[PDB]
Amino acid sequence: GSSGSSGSTMTVIKDYYALKENEICVSQGEVVQVLAVNQQNMCLVYQPASDHSPAAEGWVPGSILAPFSGPSSG
Incomplete structure (x- = not known):
């Protein structure tokens, strides 16, 4: 697997x-x-x-972003 990610995974809370x-x-x-x-x-x-x-990279308003949690959290 990976050896230490950099970005933070966020789940869209709103459309x-x-x-x-x-x-x-x-x-x-x-x-x-x-x-x-x-x-x-x-x-x-x-x-x-x-x-x-x-697969595509797009910009989104952090307002609709949230700190996901669950799998490999810690």
């Missing part, structure tokens, strides 16, 4: 829409991984292949 081209559409329940933050109060999250769309 959202990609206002820009870089941004991606997400719904309450999806799980993404944060990579960085933008001056537009956005969080570069990596969305893995999904029914809606395949």
